[PDB]
Amino acid sequence: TSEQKDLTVSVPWSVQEDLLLDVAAPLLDESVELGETDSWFYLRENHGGRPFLRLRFASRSPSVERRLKSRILAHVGPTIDAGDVFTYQPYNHEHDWLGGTAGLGLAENFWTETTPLALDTLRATRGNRALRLAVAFDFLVCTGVMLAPHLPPSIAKFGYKAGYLSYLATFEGYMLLIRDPEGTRAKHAQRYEKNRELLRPRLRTLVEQMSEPDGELTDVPELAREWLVRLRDYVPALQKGFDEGRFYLYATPRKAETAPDVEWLSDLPEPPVAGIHRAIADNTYYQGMIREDRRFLASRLAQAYTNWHLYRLGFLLADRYTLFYLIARAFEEEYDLDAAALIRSVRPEA
Ligand SMILES: OCCOCCOCCOCCOCCOCCOCCOCCOCCOCCOCCOCCOCCO
Numbered sequence: 001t002s003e004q005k006d007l008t009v010s011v012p013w014s015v016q017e018d019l020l021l022d023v024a025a026p027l028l029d030e031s032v033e034l035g036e037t038d039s040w041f042y043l044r045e046n047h048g049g050r051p052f053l054r055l056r057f058a059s060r061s062p063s064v065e066r067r068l069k070s071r072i073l074a075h076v077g078p079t080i081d082a083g084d085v086f087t088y089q090p091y092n093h094e095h096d097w098l099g100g101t102a103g104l105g106l107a108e109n110f111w112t113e114t115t116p117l118a119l120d121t122l123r124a125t126r127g128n129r130a131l132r133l134a135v136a137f138d139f140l141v142c143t144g145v146m147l148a149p150h151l152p153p154s155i156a157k158f159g160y161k162a163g164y165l166s167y168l169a170t171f172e173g174y175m176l177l178i179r180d181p182e183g184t185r186a187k188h189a190q191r192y193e194k195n196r197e198l199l200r201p202r203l204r205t206l207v208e209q210m211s212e213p214d215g216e217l218t219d220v221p222e223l224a225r226e227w228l229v230r231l232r233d234y235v236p237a238l239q240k241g242f243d244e245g246r247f248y249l250y251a252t253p254r255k256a257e258t259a260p261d262v263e264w265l266s267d268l269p270e271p272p273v274a275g276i277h278r279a280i281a282d283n284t285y286y287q288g289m290i291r292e293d294r295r296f297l298a299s300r301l302a303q304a305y306t307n308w309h310l311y312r313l314g315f316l317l318a319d320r321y322t323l324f325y326l327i328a329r330a331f332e333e334e335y336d337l338d339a340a341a342l343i344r345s346v347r348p349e350a
Contacts (some may be wrong), residue, residue, distance in 0.1 A: 016044055042118075136315060143231065283346060
C-alpha cells in the first residue's frame with residue numbers, strides 16, 4: 001500500500017535548514033497527521049561538494065514528493081535552478097559502521113523517532129551558532145557518561161572516564177590519517193586554551209547531572225535529556241542485534257573503489273600521545289575487546305548514531321572534531337586523567 005520515497009535537495013547547508021523548518025517538516029508532519037504518509041525522517045549529506053537535504057518517507061500517494069518539490073521551489077524563489085537542485089543522490093541502505101543490512105530498520109526507526117528532537121534543536125538555536133555548539137557539547141558529554149555502564153565490565157568500571165577515553169580515541173584516530181598531525185593538534189590546543197575556563201566547569205556540572213545514568217536524568221538540560229533517554233532506550237536493541245548474530249560493523253568499498261635514527265639524532269623529546277599509542281599497542285586484551293566484545297560493538301553503534309545526529313544538526317567535520325578535542329581536554333584537566341594509565345589498567349576480570 002505504502003511506497004518508499006526518497007527526495008534529495010542540493011542546496012547550501014543554511015538553506016537546507018530553512019527548507020526543513022519552514023517547508024518540509026510542516027508539510028510532512030501534516031501529511032503524517034492526515035495518514036497520507038506513514039512516517040518520515042531526514043538526513044543531511046554531501047556529494048562532490050554539493051551538500052543536500054534528504055527526505056525519506058513512506059507514502060501511498062505520489063503527490064507528496066511532488067508537493068514537496070514544488071513548495072521548495074516557491075520558498076527559495078526563482079534564484080535557484082530546479083533542474084539542478086533535485087539531482088538524485090541514491091540512498092545508502094548499507095551505511096558504513098551502522099550495523100549492516102540487518103541494522104537498517106533500527107537506524108531508520110531511530111532517525112524517525114528523533115526527528116522531532118532534531119527539529120526542536122534547530123528551531124531553538126536558529127541563527128545562534130554559539131548556542132547550537134553549547135547544545136552539542138551538552139549531549140556529547142552526557143552521551144559518553146550514559147553509555148559507560150553498558151560497556152564490557154573491564155572498561156565500564158571507568159564510568160564517566162570511559163567518555164573521556166572515547167572522545168580522545170576518536171580524535172587521536174583521525175590524527176593518524178591527516179597530512180600535518182602536529183600542526184592540526186596545535187590549532188585545536190590553541191582553541192582549548194581560549195575556552196578552558198568556560199568548558200571545564202560546564203563539563204563537571206554535566207557529569208554531576210549524569211551521576212545516575214540509568215535514572216530519570218531530571219537535572220540534565222531538556223534537549224540533552226531527550227536525546228539521552230531515546231538513545232538509551234535503543235541500547236537493549238543495539239545489544240540484542242549483536243548478541244543474536246544479526247549486526248556487524250564494517251565499511252564497504254564503493255563501486256570501482258580500488259583499495260634515519262630519530263632515537264639518536266633526537267633533540268625533541270617524546271610526544272605525550274606516543275605514550276598513549278604504546279599503551280594500546282601493549283594491551284592485546286583491550287585491542288580484542290574493542291574489535292569483538294558485543295557490548296563494545298553495541299556501544300560503537302550507539303556512537304555512530306550520535307555522530308549521525310551531529311551531522312543531522314549540520315555540524316561538519318571541523319566542528320565535530322573540535323567538539324571531541326575540547327571534551328577530551330576538559331575531562332583530562334578537570335579530573336587529572338592519564339589515558340595511558342587507564343588503558344594499561346584494562347584487564348580481563350575473574
Ligand atoms: O575515520 C575517518 C573519518 O573521516 C571521515 C571519513 O569520511 C567521511 C564520510 O562522511 C560522513 C560524515 O558524516 C558523519 C556520520 O557519521 C557516520 C558514523 O560514524 C561511525 C562511528 O563514529 C565514531 C566517532 O564517534 C564520535 C561520537 O562519539 C559519541 C560518544 O561515544 C561514547 C562512547 O563510545 C565508544 C565507547 O568507548 C569507550 C572507551 O573506549
